[PDB]
Design a binder for this molecule. Structure first.
Ligand code: HEM
Ligand code: HEM
Lengths: 735, 744
């Protein structure tokens, strides 16, 4: 009955094993913790400015929100032991009221997201092309807050779904907040913002039954796509492995729209923003990603948090595609068309700076959930263009943030606050934090000598002025004829893919269309694919039991994009960029592990910054051949192959795990998913479960012992991400 | 056959796209009962327009059509071009004067409302309740007074922990909330799928919820109790152990909302016309029986189909396989309040059916899906404080706090005090009072008076004295004697006897599943001392349970732990078979689904016999192959393919049938072999006809065969009776010792 009474006092273990070490530790070594407790020495101007709202807990009394000390937090106030609860229990009512009101509306789109703190630093001054203060000095450090997201799913949906990913960066500049709100693909599905609710309604769960969550694999999405060919380009990206990234650290970022850079002389240069991952480009395979939404719906959120806790800081290079004003009409596509990409072969990405994400938040709700990004948040030195999708976004973000964040003072929520000064004549509104002392709440005023005052535009610390673009035309609701091309960009993307990426696009479309109940929708989508590429259209049609007509086989292919048939920068894997730091290997233990193998495996993995998870049939410990006590991180079922990048089976008492269904399935799944597998000594007997002949094959590392050559072979395979050459062999594998 | 898109050019970016439906009318689902996957799913009023009740009929004034109507703004202005924003030139800036764009985007920008604090993930349906006989001797509740009185209902089933976008087949408690639209007011029976709750006093609700929910630093994990904070709370609060035992069992992973029980948990009161109070505990007994998934299948199913339960509920209703539940009452006279070892007011305690039987009171049928999920499901507001004359509360300290919570949360979730004016929430009976204003006030009051007592409207609306029928609400005059204290009743201070009773009531396979539930969850707890503290709690329940969990965690029990005296029996009972899902057979095959693995030259005689036998028992089938489209049988019969082997995995079916034909076509297909291996591992019945018996090799079954694997030269009478008998028993429990060697 002591559990139902005040107080329980000290409940922590005497050994202090409840507390995680405040130092970089590998994933699973320590319990995860709020950022300021895990890495207190990791700081920047924004993190430091948040100290005034940080609340501790240690050695403090439990109180009401009014500061009244609570004596009993286990019971309601009642008339007797077994009596009715009394209306006068203000402690119960305050505690329950706050609980009852915890939830706020989720984001209309990108509701599912994971965020981190970091910093940006430019390589050199960009004063020749932009007067933006954050890009003016190589020694200028700009704090950032980045949120990565899916699009369709709710805040409680799964991470490894097939979707476009959001990549939003809040720059806390000395001249205002700049939000770069992008996606992991260089194009969007639609051309004009007016269609945004139509497209979103089509991709989102269907209105009658609210199915499916985090999936475009349903009738309404494909109905919209079939009737709106402008969507075909982004659909091609979503159907590719781009739609299933391995991690937020292994995907690209793009602003999509052409914006303008404005220099001190007033010269405008067209710009498209890019984020290039230091970890390279890497994606999952469909079966692995779908099953991973089951085994770990928080996979990406977890991987992001744990990489930062390990010191494997996600790093991205900021890049600009720069086009002079006089080159506006030099391309086959309209620069203002967000369904069109600018090929890197035509306009190269100029590396401008680097962003490092080095600290997790303290409280997910207060920092991540309440963060408000808006592409309308630009600074002097930047400007918009007439892109009709960007134009509409400018209205949307401010409007949605009012209801989501409960009013017009959302900029006063700590995460959203600028670190630079902010002063104006705006007043009141729900939850007003700032107390204005200004005698005047209007301008022009004489009572406060007209302060705060306007600042003229200038080279630095000047007021914002829009680029004086010449506008000529009649007031029309009309799409520009220049935007009326829908097939060349999807064709360019398709031909830029490797044959194995092309197979994955075919399988992506085939799987999704098989989930469409109305067959005519499938047929209409296949007809659209025939206007892109006949090989793609035939391969999808075959998987759907659809036969193409003679007329469909005679469809003239769309033209090249300014002479380009393909661009290898559009492929995830064509150009190698694979880094092993931060990757994870499963190590399948047995009851009498050969310690020499394990010592060599771990030493080689550590040298490359590759993590390991020791797996067994149960938790606790196992004892090696030399007496070394090995702690078990998880079971074979607990941390499936889906969650790792490679599998290593060291030697020892193999008979212990040879007939274990879970051990054999672990290898079969990793095999099917094209993951590198390494087998030492008697572990080579597992080749039988994966149908591999005695002579072996590429992608299966094997030797008498785990040593120098063995580990170099496995790490080289890990640098290539997956064993693509294994694809013809997986179809026979029951996994 | 060969439908071509009507749009390939710039007409796609212009007004006047006009008729886009296929000429064959294949876009429209049949407005008649159809099996799952046969037709596209549709809003309820379009799928079943002839299915009606008093509540569904009352919603007609707010139903909005679409066919043959002009596209307009919310102000009724006809829109000419819904493809473009207004701009100064075709490549110019968007103009602030585009009121059409701004209205369309504003509405979109404001679509989301806060999800429910708990039970955010849920699926709902319309139906009706009807009592078997008048219960006037025990209650004056109008809805229970006449066997011919039909009460419309709205039911929402849910999980607890996860967000609105979380998965269905998680390990969690399930919510089972029923809104009764009675002639004397709305009565909400807001229950769960277990007879007890985790905690005793409502004051602890935010502590327990915060512990089970995603951890505050990183918001992980979703839809899972398999994390440090949950097990930390459980280890320090033994009152949680009873509901933990239920969550760790297969009760925590139901097969369908149709195959779970429902309970009000709290002891309430029934009040008759003479003023006599009878203590009552509410029960919902599923007509489809009790059935649950196995952990590996449930977890993988959150991946393959996170909408599995929502889908199964909608499709069963569209097929005419209406979810049916018997309302049951455990009745205890006032003088029997202290007759049990446990306190009746203790929500961590169940009333064993062996001590107090469940009396069948009526039946509830769910026969129509909503039209709009947001408007009807998302906006529905259930509250256990919504009682009617003939019902009353008790001093249960968890129920007492719930009375405050629901009204309070509904104000912010539903944007004000007029949430009862939201169509789904409206009573079908009259409602009149002196309450006024508030955000989005729909009702226009004509009463000259907004107060009482008043002479200006001759005191109308007026108070009604309590009585046998159509009387005012009066609380039972319960005697209250005690000092103002924040104190738990000593009678609630017992935490181990109910978890032990539950444990001993389980079959050995159910016990193995409880052990595996605890082992799997605790393996996910990072801090080892938490695992050890939970194992220590299990040792106070049952030593066999604690030892089995400890072994799976590499934990060794101390001599002191092995010497822990077991808790006492519950009023002489060591076990109650009503606590098991499977001890007493109750399995029905209607509404179950079978995967049929096709080949390129299927033996039509086998398929004709399979489908005829399945149809006779109301069992659905899904024809699967390596691709979509069609396959041609041996006699020339064209067979339509419902899904691929990967498209509709074995996780989504109750049994697998492989007919004969060209077996070589699928014999070396990895997906076809894995389908059978997964169904095998998951203890599902498997039937193999003719050359399909060659698949026994992939499931490591000897030539002589085994129980659970139906095999014959052809699919016929005996073959199908054997498979349907296996389906009636739900899973092949005898297969458990063989599954561990299976790589699946
Ligand atoms: C280039 C095309 C687009 C891109 C790259 C894009 C990207 C994003 C991203 C990354 C977020 C989430 C930021 C966060 O982490 O909180 C988001 C939020 C959102 N976007 Fe966009 N978006 C696009 C187009 C649109 C359009 C056309 C509209 C409407 C006219 C729109 C309306 C919204 C809204 C309302 C939100 C939720 C904002 C909030 O609640 O704070 N987006 N978008
Ligand atoms: C016997 C124990 C309990 C049971 C069976 C129970 C059951 C449920 C169910 C089924 C719902 C979802 C109704 C729906 O589908 O909308 C729910 C909602 C909720 N419950 Fe309870 N509950 C219990 C205890 C509590 C306690 C102790 C509190 C707070 C003191 C509480 C607060 C809530 C809240 C705030 C909601 C959301 C209601 C809304 O937003 O409409 N519940 N509960």
């Amino acid at each position: 009955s002591s559990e139902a009474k005040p107080g329980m006092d000290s409940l922590a273990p005497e050994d202090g094993s409840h507390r995680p070490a405040a130092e970089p530790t590998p994933p699973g070594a320590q319990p995860t913790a709020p950022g300021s407790l895990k890495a207190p020495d990791t700081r920047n101007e924004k993190l430091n400015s948040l100290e005034d709202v940080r609340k501790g807990s240690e050695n403090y009394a439990l109180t009401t929100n009014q500061g009244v000390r609570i004596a009993d937090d286990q019971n309601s106030l009642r008339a007797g032991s077994r009596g009715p609860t009394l209306l006068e229990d203000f402690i119960l009512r305050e505690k329950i009221t706050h609980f009852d009101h915890e939830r706020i509306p989720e984001r209309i789109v990108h509701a599912r997201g994971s965020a981190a703190h970091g910093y940006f630093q430019p390589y050199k001054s960009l004063s020749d092309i932009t007067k933006a203060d954050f890009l003016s000095d190589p020694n200028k450090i700009t704090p950032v807050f980045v949120r990565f997201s899916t699009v369709q799913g709710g805040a409680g949906s799964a991470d490894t779904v097939r979707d476009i990913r959001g990549f939003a960066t809040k720059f806390y500049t000395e001249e205002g907040i700049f939000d770069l709100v992008g996606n992991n693909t260089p194009i969007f599905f639609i051309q004009d913002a007016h269609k945004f609710p139509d497209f979103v309604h089509a991709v989102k769960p269907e209105p009658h039954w609210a199915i499916p969550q985090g999936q475009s694999a349903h009738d309404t999405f494909w109905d919209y796509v079939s009737l709106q060919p402008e969507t075909l380009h982004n659909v091609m990206w979503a159907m590719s492995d781009r739609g299933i990234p391995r991690s937020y650290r292994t995907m690209e970022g793009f602003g999509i729209h052409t914006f303008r850079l404005i220099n001190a002389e007033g010269k405008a240069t067209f710009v498209r923003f890019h984020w290039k991952p230091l970890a390279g480009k890497a994606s999952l395979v469909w079966d692995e990603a779908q099953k991973l939404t089951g085994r770990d719906p928080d996979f990406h959120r977890r991987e992001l948090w744990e990489a930062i806790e390990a010191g494997d800081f996600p790093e991205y290079e900021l890049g600009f595609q720069l086009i002079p004003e006089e080159d506006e009409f030099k391309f086959d596509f309209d620069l203002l068309d967000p369904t069109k990409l600018i090929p890197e072969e035509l306009v190269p990405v100029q590396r401008v700076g680097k962003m490092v994400l080095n600290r997790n938040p303290d409280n997910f709700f207060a920092e991540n959930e309440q963060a408000a990004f808006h592409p309308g948040h630009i600074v002097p030195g930047l400007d918009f263009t007439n892109d009709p999708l960007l134009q509409g976004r400018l209205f949307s973000y401010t409007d949605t943030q009012i209801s989501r964040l409960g009013g017009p003072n959302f900029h006063e929520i700590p995460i959203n606050r600028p670190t630079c000064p902010y002063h104006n004549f705006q007043r009141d509104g729900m939850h007003r934090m700032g107390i204005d002392t200004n005698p005047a709440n209007y301008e022009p005023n004489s009572i406060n000598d007209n302060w705060p005052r306007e600042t003229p535009p200038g080279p630095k610390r000047g007021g914002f002025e829009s680029y004086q673009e010449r506008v000529e035309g009649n007031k029309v609701r009309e799409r520009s004829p220049s935007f009326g091309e829908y097939y060349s960009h999807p064709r360019l993307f398709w031909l830029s893919q490797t044959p194995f990426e092309q197979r994955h696009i075919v399988d992506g479309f085939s799987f999704e269309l098989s989930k469409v109940v109305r067959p005519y929708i499938r047929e209409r989508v296949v007809d659209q694919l025939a206007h892109i590429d006949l090989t793609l259209a035939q391969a999808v049609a075959k998987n759907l039991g659809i036969e193409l007509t003679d007329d469909q086989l005679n469809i003239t292919p769309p033209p090249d994009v300014n002479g380009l048939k393909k661009d290898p920068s559009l492929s995830l894997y064509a150009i190698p960029d694979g880094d092993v730091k931060g990757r994870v290997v499963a190590i399948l233990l047995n009851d009498e592990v050969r310690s020499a193998d394990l010592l060599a495996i771990l030493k080689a993995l550590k040298a490359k910054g590759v993590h390991a998870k020791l797996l067994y049939s149960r938790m606790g410990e196992v004892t090696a051949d030399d007496g070394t006590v090995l702690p078990i991180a998880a079971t074979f079922a607990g941390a499936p192959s889906l969650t790792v990048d490679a599998v290593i089976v060291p030697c020892g008492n193999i008979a212990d795990i040879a007939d274990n269904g879970d051990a054999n399935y672990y290898l079969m799944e990793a095999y099917k998913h094209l993951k590198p597998i390494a087998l030492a000594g008697d572990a080579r007997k597992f080749k039988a479960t994966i149908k591999i002949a005695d002579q072996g094959e590429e992608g299966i590392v094997e030797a008498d012992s785990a040593d120098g050559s063995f580990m170099d072979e496995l790490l080289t395979l890990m640098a290539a991400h997956r064993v693509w050459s294994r694809i013809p062999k997986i179809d026979k594998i029951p996994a």
